[PDB]
Amino acid sequence: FKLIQAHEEKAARLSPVEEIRTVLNGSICGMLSTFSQKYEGYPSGSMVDFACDADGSPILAVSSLAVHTKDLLANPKCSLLIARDPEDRTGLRITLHGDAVLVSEKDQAAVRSAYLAKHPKAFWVDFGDFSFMRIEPKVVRYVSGVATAFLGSGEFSKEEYQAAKVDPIAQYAKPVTSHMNKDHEEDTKAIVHNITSIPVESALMLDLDSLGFNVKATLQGNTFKLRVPFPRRAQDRKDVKTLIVEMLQAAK
Template sequence: MSEESEKSVIRPTDDEARALAKRLMRTARFAGLAVLDPETGAPFASRVALASEMDGAPVMLISQLSHHTRALDADPRCSLLVGEPGKGDPLAHPRLTLVGRAERIAPDTQAHRHARRRYLMRHPKAKLYVDFADFAFVRLNIERASLNGGFGKAYELVADDVLLPADGLDAFQEMEVSAIAHMHEDHLDAVRLYAEKLARAGAGDWYLSSLDPEGLDFVDGDRVARLVFDAPLAAPQDLRAVLVDLAQRARARA
C-alpha cells in the first residue's frame, strides 16, 4: 500500500472520534500492553489491569517480578490496546491503541494517593497486594493514538484529543473523594439511576468510582459505565447543580 493510499483511509479527527476514544480509555478495566524485550529488542505483549487519572491518562499497577516491568525499566516506550470485543466479528468493535512512555508514580506523593484510590475503586481485590514493596503505579504519558471505530472508521489522534488540560484539575482532585463519599452516603439511589437510566448501563449495584470535569464513572463488580456531561464543568462548585439536574432527568426516565 502506498503512503498516499494509506493516508486516504484515515478520517479527519472530529468530536465524535474524540468522544469514542475517551470512552474507550475511561471505561477500560484492562489492556494489552506492548513493550520491547530488553534482551532481544523484540516486541513483547502482555495483559495489565487499568484505571485512569483525572486527565484520562491510563494507570497500571505493575509488579517488579513481571517481564513487562523489566522491559519498561529498560525502555519506557510502550503502547496499550483498549476496547472489548462483543458479539460477532471482533474486528467490527471499536478499539484504541495508545502510544507513549511509561512513567513511575513516586510513592508517598499526592499523585500516588490519587492513582491508588482510583485504581482500587476499579479493582478492589488489588487491596491484597497494592502496597507490596515490589508493586508500583505507572502512568502512560500519551504521545499519540490510533482509533479504529469499526470497519472504515480509522483516525489518528494526538494527546490533546484524548486528555483533559492539566489546568484546574487539582481542584477537582481535592473534591473528588468527599463528593463521591457524599453521593454514596446520602444519594446512592440517584447514583444508581444515573448509571441505569442515563448511562444506559442496566440494573445493578452501581457505585461511583471516579469523576472528572467531563463526566462520571461507575462500577458494578466487573462492569464499568460512563456518563458524559452535556458540557464540561468549569469549576468544582458547578458539580452540585449538574448532579441535581441529572437526578431529575434520571427519575423522569424511571
C-alpha cells in the same frame, strides 16, 4: 439496509475525541505492548489491569517480577490496546502509545485511589513488589467497524486527548443497561422501532452516554448496532430514566 446507514450518520453522539476519552476512562484492563528486554528486536504483549488518572493517563500497578516490568524499565515506550466490547470484532478498539513513568511519592496517594476506584479489591498494590507506573500518552489512535460499512479511524495528540472531558453519564451505563436488558427489553425494542423505523426482534443496550445509547439489534439473520439518541442531553442518573420513559411514552 439503507435506512440504517442514513440513521447512523445523523444520530447524535459524542465527538470522536470525547468518545475515545470516555471509553478509555471506563476501561480497566487491556493489552500492553512493550519492547522485549530478553528477546532483542521483538515486541511483546501481556495483559494488564489499569485505571486512567484524571488526565486520562493509564495507571499500572506492576510487579517487579513481571516480564513486562523489566521491559518497561529497559525501554519505557509502550502501547495499550483497549477493546470496548472485547468479543465484538466490529467494536471500537483504541491504541494508546506512550512512555511508562514511575509515579512520584507526591502523586502516590492520588494515583492509588484512582487505581482502586477501578480495582477495589487490589490490595496487593501496597506490597513492596508492586509499584505504580503511569503511561504518559504520546498519541491515541482508534479504529471502529473493521468488517462493516461504518468503518472509521483517527488519532489524537496528547493535548487533544487530555483536553476532552469524560462524559459524566457514561458511569451509569452498567445499572441502566442491566435494568433495561433484564426487565424491560420490550421498551427498548419499541423506542428503537419508533426512532429508526426498524421492527427489531431484540434490542440489547450496549453502552450509555449523556446524548443517548447504542443497541445491539437483530432483524432476520442480520445483527447490527443502532444509535438511539435522547431528545436532549441527560443531566444525571435520574434524568436518564426520565428520558427513557419519555421516549417510551412517545411510542407506547
